[PDB]
Design a protein around this nucleic acid. Structure first.
Ligand SMILES: NCCC[C@H](N)CC(=O)NCCC[C@H](N)CC(=O)NCCC[C@H](N)CC(=O)N[C@@H]1[C@H](O)[C@@H](OC(N)=O)[C@@H](CO)O[C@H]1NC1=N[C@@H]2C(=O)NC[C@@H](O)[C@H]2N1
Ligand SMILES: NCCC[C@H](N)CC(=O)NCCC[C@H](N)CC(=O)NCCC[C@H](N)CC(=O)N[C@@H]1[C@H](O)[C@@H](OC(N)=O)[C@@H](CO)O[C@H]1NC1=N[C@@H]2C(=O)NC[C@@H](O)[C@H]2N1
Lengths: 122, 130
RNA sequence: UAGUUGGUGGGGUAAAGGCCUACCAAGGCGACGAUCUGUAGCGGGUCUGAGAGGAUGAUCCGCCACACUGGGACUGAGACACGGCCCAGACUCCUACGGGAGGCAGCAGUGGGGAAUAUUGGACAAUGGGGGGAACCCUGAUCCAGCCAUGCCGCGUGUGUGA
RNA sequence: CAGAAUAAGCACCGGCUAACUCUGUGCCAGCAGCCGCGGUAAUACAGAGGGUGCGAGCGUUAAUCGGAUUUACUGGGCGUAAAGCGUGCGUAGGCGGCUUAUUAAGUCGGAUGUGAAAUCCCCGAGCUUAACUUGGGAAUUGCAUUCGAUACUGGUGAGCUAGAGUAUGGGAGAGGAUGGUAGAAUUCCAGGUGUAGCGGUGAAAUGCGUAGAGAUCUGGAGGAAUACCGAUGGCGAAGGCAGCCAUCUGGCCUAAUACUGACGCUGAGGUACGAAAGCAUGGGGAGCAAACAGGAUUAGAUACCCUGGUAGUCCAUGCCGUAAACGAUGUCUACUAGCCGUUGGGGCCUUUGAGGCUUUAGUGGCGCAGCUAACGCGAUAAGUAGACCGCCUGGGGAGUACGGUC
RNA sequence: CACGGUGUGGCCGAUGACUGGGGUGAAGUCGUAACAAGGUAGCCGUAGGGGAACCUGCGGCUGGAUC
C-alpha cells in the first residue's frame, strides 16, 4: 500500500469472537439441567462420555461435560458451568463444576481433589 | 514520468557501482552537484565534474573501488516526493552507529548529520550512505 | 436547512448573540462526510509493549450531567434546588370513607437479580463545614472500629545433636 | 510467667516443561492447552510409594496486551501459495523538468508563558524491615506568542528546452465502416449415359435405391466461408481482424529544420468499448448442430459411436456486460554484461548489386550480474529506484442470504 | 408547551402452520465424475437435458499425454 492509500483508507482490524459465548464474559454461569445423557466420541476415540444439556441464566441452552467417574446428576438439577472444550466431542464447549451447587464431588478420589471437588479424607 | 531526480541520481550511482563502471553521467542540477560535493568530501567518490554544451548541463562522477568491492556499499533515498521526512536537531538519524553518513539539507546548506548536530540544526533527511 | 443564513427597527438578559419579534434579502452546511443512525460521560491517569502502538477510564484528583418519569417557575448573591414548591404520569401507604401521606443513584439495612462484594457500630477527641459575641449546638463529611486470604508486604508453625 | 507447648496444605511428574516406578482396569472406566493416550506388562486413566514446584496458600475458569512482521508508520505482500479491475478515456485528488529573484506557509533554531496536585523515575527522610507515608528534583515528548535562518517543498514574477505537443516530405499494415464482385466446394432441382447396389462402423444396424439410387456428364437455384500465399509474420487499448476492387475513416513508423514552452504522469467516483452463448422485433437458412427421434454398445446407456434433426450459427436494429476476457505479470519514467534470429524504417561502406557494418521502433531464442521457497525471471525483469491506482489477510459456509442499483 | 387521542405511513425486535438450502457425525443404498491420455484430455463462461455424480452444443485456456 502507498502512503496516500493508507491516508485515504487506513488499516483494518478484525474483531476476535469469543469461544465461550454462553458465559457472556463471566467466569462461571448457573443453569438448570435439562437432559443428562451419554454420547460417543468422534474418531479415533470410542467411549460413553457423560454430558448434560443445560439452560443457563444468560438465556442460552448449551451442552456441558461431566468430568470424573461417577456422578449423581439428573433432570432439574442446578449446576455451575465453566468454560473448557472436550475436543473429541463435537459441540461440547463447557464443563460442569463438581461439588458446587447440586453436583457432588467424585468418590474415592485422593489426588487432584481440588479439581472434581473432593474434600480431605479423614 | 520522472518525478524524483535525486533518486534517479542515487540509482544511477548504485547501478554503476554494481556494474563496476569507472564513471557515471547524468543531467545536472545544483542540488545534485551539492550532494555530489558532500559525497566527495566524505570520500565515497573520487571526482565531480560539470560540463556545459549550451543550455544542457552534464554531471560526471568518478567512482572509487577499494580492494574488490565498491566503496559505496549502500545508498538509500530517505525523503521522497510521496513522503517528505524532516527531523529536529535531537532526532537526526545515525547510519551504522556513526560509520556511515546521513545527508541532510538544512537552512545552512547541505551537510552530514554530524555537521548538522555540531551546528545544532535540523532539516530534511535526503539519503543514507554507507 | 426556512428562524433556516445575514441585515435593520424594537424587545429581552448580569452580559455578546435569532436569545425573541416585525420586515428586507436568499442565503447557510456538505466527499476535509453534512443529514440520519449505532455506541459512549471526558481528562490527569491504569495495564501491556523494546518502541511505535493496543486495551482501559474502579478506588485518588479536576470538569460535566442526573436525583421515581416528564413540563415549569418562586425565593435568593448564588438553584431551575438529592433529603424545597407547582403541574402531569405510573406506583406505594394510612383511614372512622370525613380526609391525608411518599420518593435510599446519602450512611447502615431489606427483598430481588447475580458467579460475586461487608455492620440496621462509636465519637465529634483530630482536620474541615453551618450557626452564634461567647458559652456552646449540629455534622453517616471525617476520624475510627466490625466482617472478608480480595491484593501487597512482613513473621511464625522451633534449634542443635542423633546410624 | 508457663511450656515445644497453639499453628501445612495445594498442583504436577509423555513432549512442549523440573520431577518415575509398582499395582488395578483392558478403545471399558477415564485423561486431554496442542500433538495425542486407553484395544494384557499403560512412566499419559485410578490408587500407592518416591520425587518436583510453590507455600498460608495452591490450582481452574474468565478478561487485556504480548509473543503475532498474523492490518506490516516503525515493519508484509499480489507469475504458480490469498491477492493486478477485461481494456481504455477521464473528474476530484496525489505527485511532478531546468535557471533565477522574492516571500516565508511547510521545515529548522532561540526566548517567553503555560503544560494543577497526585501518579511514573532519581536522591534522601520516617515507619524494628518491607509494604506504606513523605521532602526536593527530574519528567510532563504538548500548546501558544514572539524573534530569527532560507538549503529543500509550497506561493508569486521572469527566463529555458532534454518531457509533452504542432506544421511540412516519405513508408508498412487481416485497423474500422459501407457497397460491389471472383473462383473452389457442399446441398437441392432438371436432363443425358448407365444398372444393382449405396451409405455407415471395431463389427453392425437404423437409412437411401428397380415410380432407377450411388457413379458419371451438362445446366440451374441458394446460403455460408475465403485453399495455395501464410510466417516465432502483420495491425489493433483490449475484445479481435485474412479472396479481390472502389468510397469514407482512425492510429503507428521514419528524416530534417521550423514552432509552443512543463501544456506532464496516474486516477477514487464516472463513462466508452467489450469473445461466445443468450434475449426482443423482422428477414434468411447451404453445411454444421444443443434439444429430440431411431439404430448400436452395455449388467444398466440416461453418454461416448451411427442415421436423422429443431433452436442457434448468417443479416438489420437494439439489449445483455460475462470468459483459464491469461503473459494467471496495472500504468508511466530512468539505469544495469553479452550472443544469435526476424518485421517496418534511417544512415554508412563496398563496388554494380548483391552483400557487410551500425541506429531506431516492434517481435523471438539463449545467457553474466542481480532476484526468487523453488520452479524460474533476466533491457519485452519477476533486477536497481521513483509517482499514482487496484487488490490480499487460514480452509469451508460463500460471490451465497438480506437490502439496494441495473 | 408537556402529557394524551385519532388517521395513515416508515424502521427495529420477538414469534409463526409450513417450506429451502448449509455444516457436522456415521458409512447404510445407486453408480464411478476427477487424479495416468483415469480409459470420451481437463477446466472457464454460457445454453439445453438428465435419479445422481454429470452429458451435449458454441467460444476460450494449457494449469494437456503421445507424436
Ligand atoms: N398532588 C400531587 C400528586 C401528583 C402526582 N403526579 C399524582 C398522584 O400521585 N396522584 C395520586 C392519586 O390521585 C391517588 O392515588 C392513587 N394511587 O390512585 C391519590 C390517593 O390519595 O393520591 C394521589 N397522590 C398524592 N400525592 C399527594 C401527597 O402526598 N400529598 C398531597 C396530595 O396531592 C396527595 N395525593
Ligand atoms: N512488456 C512486456 C510484454 C510481454 C508480452 N506481451 C508477453 C511476454 O513476453 N510474457 C512473458 C512470458 C511469460 C510466459 N507466458 C510464462 C510461460 O512461459 N509458462 C507459464 C509457466 C508454466 C510452467 N512454470 C512452465 C511450463 O509448463 N512450460 C511449458 C513447457 O516449457 C513446454 O510444455 C511442456 N509441457 O513441456 C512448452 C511447450 O508446450 O510450453 C510451456 N508453457 C507455456 N509456454 C507459453 C508461453 O510462453 N506463453 C503462453 C502460454 O501458452 C505459456 N505456457
Amino acid at each position: 500500500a502507498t502512503t496516500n492509500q493508507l491516508i485515504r483508507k487506513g488499516r483494518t482490524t478484525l474483531v476476535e469472537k469469543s469461544k465461550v459465548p454462553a458465559l457472556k464474559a463471566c467466569p462461571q454461569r448457573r443453569g438448570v439441567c435439562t437432559r443428562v445423557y451419554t454420547t460417543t466420541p468422534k474418531k479415533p476415540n470410542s467411549a460413553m462420555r457423560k454430558v448434560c444439556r443445560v439452560r443457563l441464566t444468560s438465556g442460552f441452552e448449551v451442552s456441558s461435560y461431566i468430568g470424573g467417574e461417577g456422578h449423581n446428576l439428573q433432570e432439574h438439577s442446578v449446576v455451575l458451568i465453566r468454560g473448557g472444550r472436550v475436543k473429541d466431542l463435537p459441540g461440547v464447549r463447557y464443563h460442569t463444576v463438581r461439588g458446587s451447587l447440586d453436583c457432588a464431588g467424585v468418590k474415592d478420589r485422593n489426588q487432584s481433589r481440588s479439581k472434581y471437588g473432593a474434600k480431605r479424607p479423614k | 514520468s520522472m518525478q524524483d531526480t535525486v533518486a534517479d541520481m542515487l540509482t544511477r550511482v548504485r547501478n554503476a557501482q554494481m556494474a563496476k563502471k569507472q564513471t557515471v553521467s547524468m543531467p545536472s542540477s545544483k542540488l545534485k552537484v551539492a550532494i555530489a560535493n558532500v559525497l566527495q568530501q566524505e570520500g565515497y567518490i573520487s571526482n565531480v565534474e560539470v560540463a556545459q554544451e549550451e543550455t544542457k548541463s552534464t554531471l560526471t562522477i568518478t567512482l572509487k573501488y577499494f580492494e574488490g568491492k565498491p566503496v559505496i556499499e549502500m545508498v538509500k533515498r530517505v525523503s521522497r516526493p510521496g513522503l517528505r521526512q524532516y527531523r529536529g536537531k535531537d532526532k537526526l538519524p545515525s547510519v551504522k552507529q556513526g560509520l556511515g553518513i546521513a545527508i541532510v539539507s538544512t537552512s545552512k546548506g547541505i551537510m552530514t548529520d554530524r555537521a548538522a548536530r555540531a551546528a545544532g540544526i535540523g532539516g530534511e533527511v535526503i539519503a543514507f550512505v554507507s
